[PDB]
Each structure stands twice: as C-alpha cells, then as structure tokens.
Write a protein that binds this ligand. Structure first.
Ligand SMILES: [Fe+2]
Ligand SMILES: [Fe+2]
Ligand SMILES: [Fe+2]
Ligand SMILES: [Fe+2]
Ligand SMILES: [Fe+2]
Ligand SMILES: [Fe+2]
Lengths: 149, 149, 149, 149, 149, 149
C-alpha cells in the first residue's frame, strides 16, 4: 500500500504495542502487591486480563511485521512512547491499587481511542483491530470500577 | 530478620526483578522479529525461555513480598535499575539478533553473578534462589551461542 | 569426613531437629484451638504446614543418621535444645494465636538462620538443606502475617 | 454438665493428650534409629502405630474442646504431665530399642488404665474413649514383645 | 565470565567428571562380582546408584560445555585425574566388596568436598551442583555401611 | 572344562570386556562434545550404540563369571589391556569426531576379530558370542562412515 501512511500507521501501532507492554507489566505489578487472603477476588480478576493484554501486543506486533516494519517492545521503547505517569500508589491497599489501575485504563482507553481516530483515514484494517481491543479494555475497566464501589 | 539488610536485600532483588522483566520483554522482542520460515528453529527456542524468565520474576517478586517490601515491575523501574544498553541490532537477521541476545545474556548473567556475591553475607536464602536462576540462564546462553556457530 | 566437625554439625542439626518437632507440636496445638466456623481459613492454612514441617524433621533426622550419629526427637531433647519461650496465648482467639504463631516463626527462622551461618565453614551440604527449609518457613510466616492484617 | 468434674475430666484428658504426643514423638524417635536393612520388619511395624497414636491425640484434643477447655500439646505441657523417664537406650540395636519401647508402652498403658479408673465416676463417655485406645495400645505392645522374643 | 577462573573451574569439574566415570565403572565392577543368590539385596542396591552416578557425570559434562570447554571422559583422563588407588579386593565376598566400595566413597566424597571448597570463591553455581551430588553420594555410602554392619 | 584354556579364554574375554568399557566411555565422550543444533543427527546416532555396547560388556562380564573367574572393568584394567591410542581430536567439529570414532571402531573391530581367531581352538561358545558383537559393531561403523561422506 502507501509507503508514507505505512510509516504513519506503523508508528501509531508501535505506540499501541508499547501501551500494551506497559499495561501488562503494570498488571503484573498490581498483581504482585495485591496478593492477599481477603484480596483473592482481585488476584484472580487480574490473571485473565494479563494474558489477554499480552495477546493484544502479539496481534499488534504481528500486524506491524505484516506492514513491513519491525516491532519494538524493548523497555526503552515503552517509556519513550508512553503518555501518562508511572504507576504510583498513595497507599498499599486493595482499593488504592484498584483506583490506580482504573486511571491507567483511562489512560490506555484514551490513547487507543486516539489511535483509532487517527487511523480512520489511514488504515481501516488496523483500526478494526484496535476497535476490538477497546471494547474489551473498556469492559475490564468496568470490572475494576465495580469493585471500588 | 535484620531491618537494614532486609532493605539491602530487597533492593538487590528489586534490581533482579527488573533484570528479568527487561529480559523477557527483550525475549518477546527478539521473538517478534525473528519469526520467519527458515528461522523456525529459533522462534521455538525463545518460547520456553520467555515462560521460564517470567517465572523467575514471579519467584523474585514473591520473595520480595515475603521480606516485607513491595515489588516493582513497572516500566520506569526497569530503565532506572537497568545496567546495560537497550537492545539494538545492527541488522535484521537471525544471526544479528542471536548475537545481540548473546550479549544481553552476558549482561544478565554478570549482574546476577554480582547480586549473588553481594548476597553472600546478606541473605543466603535469596542467594540460593539466584544461584538456581543463573545455572539455567547460563544454560540458555549456551544454546544461543551454539546457534551463532 | 572430619570427626570433630561431624560432632559439631550433628549437634547443630540435632538442635534443628528439635526446632522442628517443637514447631509441629506447636502447629498441631494452634490447630486444635483455632478450629471454628469463621476460622476455617486458618484451620486449613495450618494443615499443609504441619505435614511439611514433619517432613523437614525427617530430612534432618535422616541427615544426622547419615553422618553417623543417632537422632533424638524425644520430648526431653526438645525443651533442652529449645531457645525461646513456650507457646503462651494472651487470649483464645484467631488473631491472638496467629500473632503468637508469627512470633514462634520469628524464633524458628532466627535459629535456622543461625545454624546456617554456623555451618558456612562446617558443612555446606547440611547448610543447603537448611537454606531450603528457611525459604519455605519464611514463606509460611508471610501467610500468617498477611492474615493478622 | 458439672463445672468441677469437667475441670477434673479435662485435666485427666489433658494428661492423656500429653501421653500421646510423648508416645508418638518417641515412636518417631525409635523409628529414626532403627532404620536398617535387616530391621525392615520393624521400621514398617512402627509406621502404622505412629499414625494411629497421632489419631488418638486428635480424638482426645477434640474431646477436650468439646468439654469447653482448650487442648495443650506444646512441648512444655508434655514434660510437665509426663510420668515416667525419657526414652534412654543402653545400646543402639533393634532389640534394645524394642525392649525400651516395650517399657514405654508399659508406662502408657498403666497411666491410661489409671485415667480410665479415675473416670469411672466422673465421665463414662471420655472413659469409653480411653478404653478403646487401651485395647489397641495393649495390642501393639504385644507385637513389640513378640519381636523381642 | 572470567576467562582464568573459567579455566580453573573447568579443570575442577573435569576432575569431578572423571571421579564419576571412575565411580560408575567401579560400581558396575562391584555389581558384576557380587551377583549371587544370597547377595540379591546388594545387586539391587547398586543398580539405582549406577544410573544416578552416570546422571551426575552428564550434568557435569553439560556444565563444562556450558562454560565453553569440552568434556573429557576418556579412560586416559580418568587415571590421570584419579586420586586414590584402584579397586582392589582382599577377598571375593559380599562384605569385602562392600567394605571396598565404602572406601571408594570415602575417596569420592572427600574429593568432592574439596572441589566444593575450592569453588567457594570461583563459581557458586557449579558449587551448588556439586553440593547436591554430595548429599546423595554421602547418602548412598550410609546404605553400604549399614550393610557391612 | 579345561583349567588352562579357561584361563586363556578368561584373559581374552577380560580384554574384550575392557575394549567395551573403553568404547562406551569413548562413545559417551564423543556424545558430550558433539551435542549441537545441526549435529542432532549424530547425537541421536550415538545414543543406541552406547546402550548396545554397555550391553555387550554385561554379556562378556557374565560370561567370565560363568567360566569361574571374576570380571574386571575398573579404569586401571582398561588402560592396561587397551591396545590403541586414547581418543584425540585434531579439531572440535562433527566430522573430526566422526573420523576419530571411525578409527576407534577400526581398533575395536580388529581386536575383536583377533580374539575371535584366538578362540577358534579354545572356546567356540565364547567365540560365537564375539562373532555376534562384531556384526553389529561393524554395522555401526558403516553408519559413522556414511556420515563422514
Ligand atoms: Fe469487526
Ligand atoms: Fe557460601
Ligand atoms: Fe540448592
Ligand atoms: Fe462401669
Ligand atoms: Fe547453596
Ligand atoms: Fe558359529
């Protein structure tokens, strides 16, 4: 297809790839701190989301490689493309971490919604890929919110 | 046990935790670029090592939490504690990536050997944990080298 | 091997053997008092630890016999080698007993850490045996603490 | 039932609880020293008796808790309530240990027969519990004697 | 890692490799002479130890190859690195051969304990490998001694 | 049978026993150095031959014991009876090691052919035993040669 847009598209995806790696490192981080006896509801809530996100990265990576470029998911590439602030907690409790996760998902969902809009004129294939992820990410966020409450 | 050393130990482990997250992001990165038809030997070589490393992080994370501290595997924490340079390739080929991986393992094995020496007087439990990892990491490196050749 | 050290080693192990018998009598004691309907989490938490500790004694006993001496796990030998105070509770509740258990494990882990240090120059085999136990004992203590909280 | 006798009964049982813990530590002690190639008959003879005795303690402990008191099977409580002398051997052989075991069972059976007589007017339930144990303990002693011979 | 020590380590392992090949040729030798009807206890005692030792060599060989050197288990290399005297018997009986085996294990355990001490500053990985072997070798020796008796 | 020849026969077999132990130590040696990714054909070629040779030794050992003598497969006995030179390689490659193996088999097959001729007048039983081995040894050599090529 188009040699420029392919670069434009690849750079959007490449950012989304880093959004995911960032998220599933963060997911694995919240998982490690929230592992307690009354917190069993949550430690299990995170598990499938970790696997699901890692899967999303794999889809995006494979999509980048299909477009001709090479995927980057090295830690340098994550901080560089990363938009929002690192996962800080005010306190070490279940609800703090949930609240904090809730905001990371606000971050992820928002940047995704952005890449989707940017792709409207560039590549509707890669768009539909990201639209799919968003439904589920937005879905998981609901599950975190409903716990807070 | 001892309140200072526990901080000294935790900070050593915390670094090792980041060594691992860095490695298995890197492993997943080399995996994504080396996925080709004549490269099938390698794409499968990486697979078990990814899982194995993620497991190592989980052990270290759980060990940190046992000592009373909280594990950090957020992307910020990776670059901060990271010693060597980001995974750069000169070229996009199987042997370049192998060679590059080989050096990352030199990096990982060396910092691990260091944490092990530093722990000799601090915490022989956490040491034996890391000694175990090293045998296998050093083992996998051999497998990468033997391919180069 | 060396005829003196073997006596030095045997006497260290023999103490560890008594640490274990003391612990799994204590574990079985806390188990018997904490057996209540809202306390089901805990009565089941203790079960595997009892079996695991009895196993540790069996390893140590068998190690003593391998070194040429005879193991002693008679009740006299337990009080004699025992370092810390008998398991007293302030009150008969779940959290009192947990708190009390937590401190017994502080006791056990500390004496073990000691035998490990003393064995650094004497017998690295018997050391590695005890290093292994410590990781798990320290692990179980975490599980008790996380309940208190 | 009666508030005094319940204290009288509990204190009898509590002693029996300690008789058992003492016995199955002793059983596990004789087991550890008698583990040899021509001694295979015996190392296997002990095994089921250990499990059986630990079971007896569990019955007695649970009976104490049913009467309202709390069971004590801590090592201090064993030496305190213990009547006869600690398990000493003249020599380290199969028949010495058997002979020594034989006498410990004389000790156990005699104190049990006592608690049974004392309970004749106090609590026929707890009595029947102990009468049952005695038949089997007396049975196992026979098996030890028949080996000596 | 370090280019000298790697040579120092390799030469220690290489000696241990030869200790093992020497042992499991010796084990297979004692096995062949002790194969009699009343000697069935022993002919079966040796069997698992042969397999276990051959396994030890394979671990050490593979460890040497991991360090970059090439393993040598040719018969020349065995006599050269061998410390103690060849397996001579005074008489052809079960107990002579056991006694003789007992001393070979004294030899093996002692040289292993040595390589372990020498490795304390050189390579704690390869050390832990040898510490593991020693526990079991020392264990098997016990089984031989307990037969003599 | 005949008291001298039995000594003559035993000493021929005893040499063949050492030929085998020498070979399957050598086989296990070539196996350890040739374990590489493109070398998978070979690492698997060696495996069954190792087992097969160890089996040959067991047959010969058992045959010696049947004739009244005692088998010797100690490392001293191997170098003493050994005819040809120790397994040296010019280089560490697959084809060098094959070539080197090829020559060891020339050595083994030749000494076997000799023991067979020497046994023509001494013991046709033990001969037929060795004739059998030769067919297969000569067979395996073919497989090594066909690889070189
Ligand atoms: Fe769709
Ligand atoms: Fe050490
Ligand atoms: Fe270990
Ligand atoms: Fe009655
Ligand atoms: Fe260790
Ligand atoms: Fe024939």
């Amino acid at each position: 297809l188009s040699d420029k847009k392919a670069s434009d598209v690849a750079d959007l995806l490449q950012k989304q790839l880093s959004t995911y790696n960032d998220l599933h490192l963060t997911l694995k981080h919240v998982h490690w701190n929230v592992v307690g006896p009354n917190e069993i509801g949550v430690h299990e809530m995170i598990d499938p989301q970790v696997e699901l996100v890692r899967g999303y990265a794999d889809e995006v990576a494979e999509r980048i490689a299909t477009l001709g470029k090479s995927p980057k998911g090295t830690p340098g590439a994550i901080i560089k493309d990363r938009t929002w602030d690192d996962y800080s907690v005010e306190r070490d409790t279940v609800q703090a971490h949930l609240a904090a996760l809730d905001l990371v998902y606000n971050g992820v969902i928002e940047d995704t919604r952005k890449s989707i809009e940017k792709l409207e004129d560039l590549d509707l294939v890669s768009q539909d890929l990201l639209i799919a992820h968003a439904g589920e990410l937005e879905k998981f966020q609901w599950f975190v919110r409903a716990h807070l409450e």
